[PDB]
Amino acid sequence: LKQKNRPNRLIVDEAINEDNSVVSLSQPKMDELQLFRGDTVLLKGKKRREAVCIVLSDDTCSDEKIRMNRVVRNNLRVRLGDVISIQPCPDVKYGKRIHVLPIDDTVEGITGNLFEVYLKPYFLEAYRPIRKGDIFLVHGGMRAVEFKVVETDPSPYCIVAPDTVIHCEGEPIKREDEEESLNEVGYDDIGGCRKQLAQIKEMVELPLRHPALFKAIGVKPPRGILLYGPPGTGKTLIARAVANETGAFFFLINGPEIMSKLAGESESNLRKAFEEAEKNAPAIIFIDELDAIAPKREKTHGEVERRIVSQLLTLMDGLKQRAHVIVMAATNRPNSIDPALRRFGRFDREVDIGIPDATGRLEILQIHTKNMKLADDVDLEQVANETHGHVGADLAALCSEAALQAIRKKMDLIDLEDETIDAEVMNSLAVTMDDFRWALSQSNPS
Amino acid sequence: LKQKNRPNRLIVDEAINEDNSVVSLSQPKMDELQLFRGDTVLLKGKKRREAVCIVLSDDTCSDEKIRMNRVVRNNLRVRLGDVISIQPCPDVKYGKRIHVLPIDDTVEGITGNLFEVYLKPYFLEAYRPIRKGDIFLVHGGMRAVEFKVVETDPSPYCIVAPDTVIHCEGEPIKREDEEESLNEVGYDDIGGCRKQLAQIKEMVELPLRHPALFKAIGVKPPRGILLYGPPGTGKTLIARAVANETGAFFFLINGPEIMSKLAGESESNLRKAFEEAEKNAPAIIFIDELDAIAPKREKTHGEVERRIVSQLLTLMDGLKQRAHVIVMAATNRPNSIDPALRRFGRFDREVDIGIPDATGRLEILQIHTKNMKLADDVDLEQVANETHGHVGADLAALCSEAALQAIRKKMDLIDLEDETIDAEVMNSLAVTMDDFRWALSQSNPSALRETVV
Numbered sequence A: 001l002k003q004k005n006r007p008n009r010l011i012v013d014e015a016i017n018e019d020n021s022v023v024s025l026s027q028p029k030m031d032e033l034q035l036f037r038g039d040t041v042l043l044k045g046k047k048r049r050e051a052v053c054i055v056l057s058d059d060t061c062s063d064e065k066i067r068m069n070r071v072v073r074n075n076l077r078v079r080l081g082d083v084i085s086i087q088p089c090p091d092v093k094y095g096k097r098i099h100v101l102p103i104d105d106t107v108e109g110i111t112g113n114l115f116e117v118y119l120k121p122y123f124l125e126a127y128r129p130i131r132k133g134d135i136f137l138v139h140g141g142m143r144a145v146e147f148k149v150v151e152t153d154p155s156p157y158c159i160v161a162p163d164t165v166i167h168c169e170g171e172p173i174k175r176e177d178e179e180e181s182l183n184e185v186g187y188d189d190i191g192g193c194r195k196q197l198a199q200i201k202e203m204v205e206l207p208l209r210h211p212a213l214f215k216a217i218g219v220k221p222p223r224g225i226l227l228y229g230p231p232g233t234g235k236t237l238i239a240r241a242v243a244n245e246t247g248a249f250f251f252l253i254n255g256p257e258i259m260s261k262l263a264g265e266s267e268s269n270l271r272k273a274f275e276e277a278e279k280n281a282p283a284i285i286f287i288d289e290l291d292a293i294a295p296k297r298e299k300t301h302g303e304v305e306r307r308i309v310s311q312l313l314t315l316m317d318g319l320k321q322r323a324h325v326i327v328m329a330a331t332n333r334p335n336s337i338d339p340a341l342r343r344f345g346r347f348d349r350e351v352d353i354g355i356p357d358a359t360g361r362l363e364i365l366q367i368h369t370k371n372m373k374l375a376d377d378v379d380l381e382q383v384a385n386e387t388h389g390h391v392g393a394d395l396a397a398l399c400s401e402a403a404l405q406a407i408r409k410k411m412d413l414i415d416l417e418d419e420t421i422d423a424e425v426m427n428s429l430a431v432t433m434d435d436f437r438w439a440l441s442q443s444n445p446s
Numbered sequence B: 001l002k003q004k005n006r007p008n009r010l011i012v013d014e015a016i017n018e019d020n021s022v023v024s025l026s027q028p029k030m031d032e033l034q035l036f037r038g039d040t041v042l043l044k045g046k047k048r049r050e051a052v053c054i055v056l057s058d059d060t061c062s063d064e065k066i067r068m069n070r071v072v073r074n075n076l077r078v079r080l081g082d083v084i085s086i087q088p089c090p091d092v093k094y095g096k097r098i099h100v101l102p103i104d105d106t107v108e109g110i111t112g113n114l115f116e117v118y119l120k121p122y123f124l125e126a127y128r129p130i131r132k133g134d135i136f137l138v139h140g141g142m143r144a145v146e147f148k149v150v151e152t153d154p155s156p157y158c159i160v161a162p163d164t165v166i167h168c169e170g171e172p173i174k175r176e177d178e179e180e181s182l183n184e185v186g187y188d189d190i191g192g193c194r195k196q197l198a199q200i201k202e203m204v205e206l207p208l209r210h211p212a213l214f215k216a217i218g219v220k221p222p223r224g225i226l227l228y229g230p231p232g233t234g235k236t237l238i239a240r241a242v243a244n245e246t247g248a249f250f251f252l253i254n255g256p257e258i259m260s261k262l263a264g265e266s267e268s269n270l271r272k273a274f275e276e277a278e279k280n281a282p283a284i285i286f287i288d289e290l291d292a293i294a295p296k297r298e299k300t301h302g303e304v305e306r307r308i309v310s311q312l313l314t315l316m317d318g319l320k321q322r323a324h325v326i327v328m329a330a331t332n333r334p335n336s337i338d339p340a341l342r343r344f345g346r347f348d349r350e351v352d353i354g355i356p357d358a359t360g361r362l363e364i365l366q367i368h369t370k371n372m373k374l375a376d377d378v379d380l381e382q383v384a385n386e387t388h389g390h391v392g393a394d395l396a397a398l399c400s401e402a403a404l405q406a407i408r409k410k411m412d413l414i415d416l417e418d419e420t421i422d423a424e425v426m427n428s429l430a431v432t433m434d435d436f437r438w439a440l441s442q443s444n445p446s447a448l449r450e451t452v453v
């Protein structure tokens, strides 16, 4: 499973100064796709992000490309060169009411009514399509304020008509909250695991999306997938990526979290997890650190511990064939899991999330430095070559250490007590190859 | 115990275009059986399925055969060539009301009042016999809708007379739910176990059905039957089969399920199991994964664990001789079970559910591919010969892997994101002998043939 050419899959191209509500295609592409000037369209990017836009023809736009500005790209979680899909969006109703909120660092020193100075002029007679979760910037007077759509009615998208009530009351959204959302883990945040992610799409996502495929040929897909491998290889990261990328309902079950609960509560929470999944099928259940809740029914002296293992076995068996629920799990101690959980019809497929090679190490180093300020002498391939035996977590730690060393080198220009770090220290901060070589000397993968 | 020739046992034969309410016999058969034109009859198929029909003579019908259409065959869970039984059904009364529901995939884009367009014209002045659980198809305008009979009054069958109230209101039945039902496990879904299924019928079904036989000769039949053998040999499958085939009440007790319950709740559920069985006798109790609830009273450090074992012992002893309850159990670790449970009067009979041979393996492979699209080059006897050391579960896994490989080969025509798989990919999908060879050559099937020489 790689990415196939389809007529509605298009490469993201720039449109500086373009309005937030507009995307451009070439006329032949529009003709191919049966899209007419002014049509509302639905765009799909990464990590299940969507955007509703107006489509306009552009004779400077290549057939295979879509022009869109930076606001739309950010909402779609995509960069220039990425691929998106476009489809008609005919069903879109005029809005009854919408609720948007300002981002806290764009309104410090509250001056000017937000509705009157920003939103009213932005939406005035424009009939903008909007979607819940959109972030958009607006200029008002000599200032710019960033807003988030928190709710729309109808949900999750509508047209902002003259009659749509615009609510902007409440506590401003924190930049840190939205920045945490903005860099939620996707498949792109996973290095050195191309083969495994493909195993995962074929065993988990494909049967949940297209069960007709499996019915057609007359095969029941396996329902239990164990990720295993040593610590820090990316098992939990992959879970986060699946959670954020899948089209199914996702229910995370954390091993130590169940085990931390009162006797009786552990079992109950497991049952509720499976029930929620079932009710919301198609669904994925992910049981992280499976060994914590399901060790061999001999290496648990506790009656409650054996009981919880029994409870999971019952829940795995209890999942009807037509439930459309795939259970994923992860462990760094697979030989410690009760063998009963590994029988036909339970966890009977396995995916080795192991030690990356040099090429995978480089992938991982590029991912973990993407938001890091690097000097021009940083050679990551050279770092990749010198980190044999390192897994993903050792590489992220190495990157952090090089950064921390870069900061340590300015401790002669920082005083802990100042309320403000000197701007020119802030502006010039870069991680150098030397900082990396120094971390390479401190890095111990154990 | 094999199948005996009886005058009312007949071979299922085709009747294309026949009405859903009609079966045909030869006139001599009808004479033999004392059946007259238009009589209502009760048909019995597999997995306790029944059908009520009208019987008509047919001079093209062999004496030993019964003609019936595809609707009736599906209701009886039988195919062409299977045997069914027929008997008069004189007791049948006009229904006060019946309730049916459409199948969801037959009503998408809800066009038409279902009663007026389909049911009314289907039942109009026809006086159709119908049974709870029947599925039947009806054409109305340019469409066809499949319905299930969910309830009848009287129950479970009646005649749909002019004055019978037909209800079709409610949420449509899911096709997936009925496909699951249709493919519920029977004795035909168990391969390579002929000898053991006979042991089971002789030790379980026979004393429950004909206790007089055992009384007459003066013998108390054993009341505890332990199925044992290695993992994936079909112990649970057999339990499913028995549950769906037996004429008795069936109460399943799952080991890990009892063990997952609160201290005190485990013991209570065991008691309730035995009580329900007793109240509903003749009954079978099946305790799957017995080792989970009854390991040796030394290899359990838990007071509650020892208490549960004691509870089962008490419940086994507590079953009066006239209770008409047979307890089956299954385990893949029989030497781990408390020896007290294997004394005279408890689990004192045993059935070895073991490794199949090549002929058994082939049976298993035909069962597991019956609903699978096979290419013409698939040679299952050859697959049987190349799976030494394989049990049932390994054969089902082998089949699934071949099919999964077949799908993997089309991953250049499938994009995960499409709403719809391309039709001609759907239509042409078949598992080939190469797909099977690929599955056979895999680490796991290959490591497994060494295991049993």
Ligand SMILES: Nc1ncnc2c1ncn2[C@@H]1O[C@H](COP(=O)(O)OP(=O)(O)OP(O)(O)=S)[C@@H](O)[C@H]1O
Pocket: A189, A190, A191, A192, A193, A229, A230, A231, A232, A233, A234, A235, A236, A237, A238, A331, A332, A364, A367, A391, A392, A393, A394, A396
């Ligand atoms: N394949 C990878 N690609 C990119 N970053 C990775 C990878 N593996 C690990 N990392 C980094 O290391 C961090 C910790 O890894 P986790 O996914 O929590 O390890 P894990 O495999 O779940 O470990 P265990 O078994 O719970 S100790 C991640 O959150 C990433 O920042």
Ligand SMILES: Nc1ncnc2c1ncn2[C@@H]1O[C@H](COP(=O)(O)OP(=O)(O)OP(O)(O)=S)[C@@H](O)[C@H]1O
Pocket: A343, A344, B189, B190, B191, B192, B193, B229, B230, B231, B232, B233, B234, B235, B236, B237, B238, B331, B332, B364, B367, B391, B392, B393, B394, B396
């Ligand atoms: N004799 C058989 N005939 C046909 N199919 C079988 C047979 N045995 C196993 N299978 C297949 O393998 C699957 C698992 O078999 P089960 O009956 O659950 O195994 P089991 O013997 O109960 O295993 P344990 O002891 O609980 S691990 C079944 O659902 C069938 O698909």
Ligand SMILES: [Mg+2]
Pocket: A235, A236, A237, A288, A289
């Ligand atoms: Mg982890």
Ligand SMILES: [Mg+2]
Pocket: B235, B236, B237
């Ligand atoms: Mg079993």
